[PDB]
């Protein structure tokens, strides 16, 4: 399997562009940035609102937790390659603690409101507007030969007051190379695409389109997360319970995938549950036929069937957003 778009981006660009292992970090000055307050955390890092001492400009300080040198060069290279793209967080500097050599990635300041409190207040139009903004970021990174591999609400910072969006945490991102077999242990469980759940290693940019689909479904249906599986095995079951097993079987045979006996047993046999079956008094104001058609074209078992970020942006669902632009 290969991407249906941007497949040769890294094939045509010089080795230095994607050969991140050959990167030699130009460490800046650790004293230039001061922590002001913590604002977040993850299994791989701690994030603080900071201040650039030279210009007293606010910034974001991401202190990385101990991890392999390769992974750190990877995140840095991708950040340097995407800097300046639409809605892509901007890496401003890279410093390290002299004594322990703990790395810190310095970014432009980003204002944010946790999705569990922001999302409930979004209007039908806000949702169209912000998803469109996210799609710009995804079409861009894909056009540059990179898969984010961890699209989820937590990684989409939004400054609702200024209606500004940024795609963050490129710590799991990778460069796409035709035919390469990647690690399937990426993204977050509720947003893992079927390819990751059934061990299809030669996946591509389309992976992010499933994750986006899950996020979108949660937003219009007010059911977060939309696919709530306890572990990887269960994650596929919850998915099968909605899209139906027939579609799953067509998919597995096309890619010659062997489902683990145990897992196959858990999935079972299920009919498809129409999207409208998910509409209720709490989400009726956000569910529209255009929203359903868009979502339907994203959540497909077969990754080659999903809409590309570029295709997604032209769907009539975003008509007024484009018109506004
Ligand atoms: O990784 C990031 C991150 C980044 O890579 C670039 C800019 C901002 C953030 C960020 O803000 C953030 C937060 N958080 O919301 O506090 C929580 C967990 C994270 O892993 C991050």
UniProtKB/Swiss-Prot annotation:
For this protein, the record's InterPro entries field holds: CK2_alpha (IPR045216), Kinase-like_dom_sf (IPR011009), Prot_kinase_dom (IPR000719), Protein_kinase_ATP_BS (IPR017441), Ser/Thr_kinase_AS (IPR008271)
Looking at its record, which EC class is this enzyme? transferase
Keyword list (alphabetical) reads: ATP-binding, Kinase, Nucleotide-binding, Serine/threonine-protein kinase, Transferase
- The segment(s) forming the Protein kinase domain are 33-318
List its EC numbers. Answer: 2.7.11.1
Q: Which GO cellular component terms are attached? A: cytosol; nucleus; protein kinase CK2 complex
Catalytic activity from the UniProt record: L-seryl-[protein] + ATP = O-phospho-L-seryl-[protein] + ADP + H(+); L-threonyl-[protein] + ATP = O-phospho-L-threonyl-[protein] + ADP + H(+)
CDD domains reported for this sequence: STKc_CK2_alpha
Q: Has keyword Secreted?
A: no
Q: Name one GO molecular function term.
A: protein serine kinase activity
Q: Which BP terms does GO give this entry? A: DNA damage response; regulation of cell cycle
Write down the PROSITE patterns for this protein, in alphabetical order: PROTEIN_KINASE_ATP (PS00107), PROTEIN_KINASE_DOM (PS50011), PROTEIN_KINASE_ST (PS00108)
Q: Which residues form the active site?
A: 150
- Specify the domain of life of the species encoding this protein: Eukaryota
Give the residues the record marks as binding ATP: 39-47, 62
Q: Fill in the subunit field for this protein.
A: Tetramer of two alpha and two beta chains (possible).
Q: Output the PANTHER family linked to this UniProt entry.
A: CASEIN KINASE II SUBUNIT ALPHA
Function, as annotated, reads: Casein kinases are operationally defined by their preferential utilization of acidic proteins such as caseins as substrates. The alpha chain contains the catalytic site.
Q: Which family does it belong to?
A: Belongs to the protein kinase superfamily. Ser/Thr protein kinase family. CK2 subfamily.
The protein in question is named Casein kinase II subunit alpha
Organism the protein comes from = Zea mays (Maize)
């Amino acid at each position: 399997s290969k991407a249906r778009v941007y497949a040769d981006v890294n094939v045509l660009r010089p080795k230095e562009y994607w050969d991140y292992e050959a990167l030699t970090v130009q460490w800046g000055e650790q004293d230039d940035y001061e922590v002001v307050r913590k604002v977040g955390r993850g299994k791989y890092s701690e994030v603080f609102e900071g201040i650039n001492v030279n210009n007293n400009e606010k910034c974001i300080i991401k202190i990385l937790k101990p991890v392999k040198k390769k992974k750190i060069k990877r995140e840095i290279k991708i950040l340097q390659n995407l800097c300046g793209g639409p809605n892509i967080v901007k890496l401003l500097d890279i410093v390290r603690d002299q004594h322990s050599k703990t790395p810190s990635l310095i970014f432009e300041y980003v204002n944010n409101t946790d999705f569990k409190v922001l999302y409930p207040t979004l209007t039908d139009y806000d949702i169209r507007y912000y998803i469109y903004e996210l799609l710009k970021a995804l079409d861009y990174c894909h056009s540059q030969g990179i898969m984010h591999r961890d699209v989820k609400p937590h990684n989409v910072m939004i400054d609702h007051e200024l209606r500004k969006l940024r795609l963050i945490d490129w710590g799991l991102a990778e460069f796409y190379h035709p035919g390469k077999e990647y690690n399937v242990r990426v993204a977050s469980r509720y947003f893992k695409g079927p390819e990751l759940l059934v061990d299809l290693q030669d996946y591509d940019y389309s992976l992010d389109m499933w994750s986006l689909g899950c996020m979108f479904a949660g937003m219009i249906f007010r059911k977060e997360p939309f696919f709530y599986g306890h572990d990887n095995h269960d994650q596929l079951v919850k998915i099968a319970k909605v899209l139906g097993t027939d579609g799953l079987n067509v998919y597995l045979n096309k890619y010659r995938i062997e489902l683990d006996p145990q897992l196959e047993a858990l999935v079972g046999r299920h009919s498809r549950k129409p999207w409208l079956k998910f509409m209720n008094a709490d989400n009726q104001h956000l569910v529209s036929p255009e929203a359903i058609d868009f979502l339907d074209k994203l959540l497909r078992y077969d990754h080659q069937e999903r809409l590309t970020a570029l295709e997604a942006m032209t769907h009539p669902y975003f008509q007024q957003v484009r018109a506004a632009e």
